[model samples]
Target chain A: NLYFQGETHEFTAEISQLMSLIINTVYSNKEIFLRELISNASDALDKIRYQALSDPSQLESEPELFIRIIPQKDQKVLEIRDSGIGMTKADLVNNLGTIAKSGTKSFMEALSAGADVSMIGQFGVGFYSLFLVADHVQVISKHNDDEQYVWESNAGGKFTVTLDETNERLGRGTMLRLFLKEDQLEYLEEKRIKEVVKKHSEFVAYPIQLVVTKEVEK
Target chain B: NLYFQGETHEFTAEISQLMSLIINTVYSNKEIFLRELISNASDALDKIRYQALSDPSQLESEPELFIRIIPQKDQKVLEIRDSGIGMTKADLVNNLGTIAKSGTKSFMEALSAGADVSMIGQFGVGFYSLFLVADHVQVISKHNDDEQYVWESNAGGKFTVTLDETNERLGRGTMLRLFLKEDQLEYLEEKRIKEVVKKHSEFVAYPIQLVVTKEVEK
Candidate 1:
């Protein structure tokens, strides 16, 4: 049941330049990247659910919505899962490999023109901010229309989209694993996770629940 | 027709001694003073309305629920009014002039013993916060069943409760006047007053309108 097949992109030089800009400019305050990415995942799930209202076939894979966060504290790594709109290898390349999808130069030029465009999109320059915290990122997805694939990156110009050996598609969604930097272990704390989720995505349309329970003192 | 009448002890010398402990030490920010006062005024109004639900005569005086800010730039005197549950002259002095009625001291001791009193109200400590901002204070109140009077004070012990002209009643709203300090002139700006209302009192369950105008930008 591979929802995502292969991916493709019409790459241009602008893609490399945009990746460089993001890697360089967003070196500080990077926890926001995970928050933004999770928000994007929720949005994707919402879109498919809306489409499923008219076409019931869209729910054949799995109609249930859920978010799970797993942290390997010893490795200082965190993984988040969501059953949203998946992407194939080609989709991953076009979406992650190039700047054709994200008009980065025009966005930066808008900033130069004294226009405020802070409200951009899911991957708008913000996705690359991951480099600020993590040394590496691995994303696995299986789109509804294609074969399964894994997209891996280090926030630089180079990223890889290859067939995942763990072809066991995660039902109908995406899973993200972040290799946290040495000093960024705060990201693994249950309280910290809940605080960030509550702050950035509490009112999100999807039900967001964390597993931490604070102990009450008598 | 006064429902209740009693005398409240003036601030004790011990209160001055513990000043560095509670009001000055416990409160980290001065902005909290305005927040508490506005909330208290709103709660009072809510209490009266709840009472009027079963006994309509409780609202027979045609009490209007409104928060009025009369700014006097020339005199440096601002009168803040709220048509709420009015307190009798005795009730005013008891609640305002004294700390003898409540178990605040014992409670404060428990808090020092590491008990959690963070969310609990000290009953009358909120009014004392006015001293953090104002030089002198006067509360003119007309209760639903009691004679109108003014309770005037400058914190350290001395307080006076006297018969008022009685014509200043807005059908039983409390009018408080603060003698502004020279350095606090920024607060006299109309914009600051409007901003405070927009922020802390936005959902105060009543129309908290300020002076407004529509200016078409060129």
Candidate 2:
């Protein structure tokens, strides 16, 4: 009988309940949405950056690590592509899918029973908020050990995963495609995007570039 | 003007500078945009409540004072309407117009001269944070005297106070409409906006409410 039992709890509605709580209640600011995602990307890049110190070819095409936002005005789409460590299949599922899942009793007991309140991050999965704004989203990720795959989702509760074959669409890394809602179109504006980046991800230790046209005055 | 040795100085460029400083830097967390506004609202409620204890009819209406937020997602706009003692035409120009129009230099001097730093409220003019998220803002206000008017501005530079149709509008209060940019749309999210109110203003002596979308329990 080989099953999983740690805190010996069943995955009830409570799992989703906790997830919604993290999504809806606890992390209660919209501005931090951009900030948090970029920071997570930076963390991934930082790991690879450290690794690159010894081996420069760890990343795809040995491209310089940075975050680039490509805004598609036609389909109301935006992509935040990062040349980070990319992801192994396990890293993808384990990290994003189960991010909002938290240990409630233990966490509440720790805080209520006088444990340090900063332990919310100890569970290793807080980067799943990219879904909140997009209608249909895609994660085209190139892992270290495998070919690139496009994880597509309408976010109608599930997503489709398949090997991506778009030649030169992206280098080895992750490209997050956001099919933006009308309300979220503000992400397309350069000035607004820059302000959000500066506010939340300013210290992420990577360069963030925006591809857009602007009126220049002489 | 039978008052203290002090008089209202036109906030002018100085006031514009103060607006930028307070909206952007001093309040680095624009999440507190509603907080600052609600705090000002509560202060007004307090003022009116105090006056009600004396002359109750002096209020434009006694329909139980509160603050309201109307989300204009279509226009990518949002509005904060309050019934808390609206400003007069002069009050509008003085409070919302003229920069640092309400001086705080003696506030600095007093702090330097060893007065309790918290006593600076008497200097006047604290409702400037409205400029934070607003690109083009209009404040249609009804003062205790004179005709009701609209004080509109891009607030990047100059502002205007014109006599709007006072009929059916605020007879003694103000309605603030903000033409918000796309990035600032987070302020329009009902859930996020509600949290901001709760964070900075739950304890306000008046009831503030946001009507939740009706539940559909099919």
Every model's TM-score: 0.40, 0.40
Off by over 4 Å in 2: A1-22, A25-28, A97-100, A103-125, A155-160, A166-168, A213-218, B1-218
Point to the candidate with the largest lDDT: 1
Output candidate 1 Cα RMSD.
Answer: 24.9
Q: What DockQ does candidate 1 score? A: 0.00
Residues B30-67, candidate 1, lDDT per residue (tens digit)? 44556556777787788788888888787766556767
Write the residue-wise lDDT of candidate 2 on A1-218 in tens digits.
21222211222122332232333333334455576568777877888788878987775454789888877777788878888888766566554444413433332333234333233354532443553455456777776776777755433222345567762555667888877767678888888889988877767778898898555787
After superposition of all CA atoms, the RMSD between model 2 and the true structure is 18.3
Top-scoring candidate (DockQ): 2
* Residue pairs in clash, model 2: B11-B98, B11-B99, B11-B101, B12-B99, B15-B99, B15-B100, B86-B173, B88-B143
Ten-residue stretch with the least lDDT total in model 2 chain B: B1-10
Q: In angstroms, how far off is B58's CA in candidate 1? A: 3.2
Question: Compared with the true structure, what per-residue lDDT tens digits does model 1 show for residues A6-115?
Answer: 21122222232334333434244556666776776887788778788889787777678777777767677777778777776776766663443453343334233422
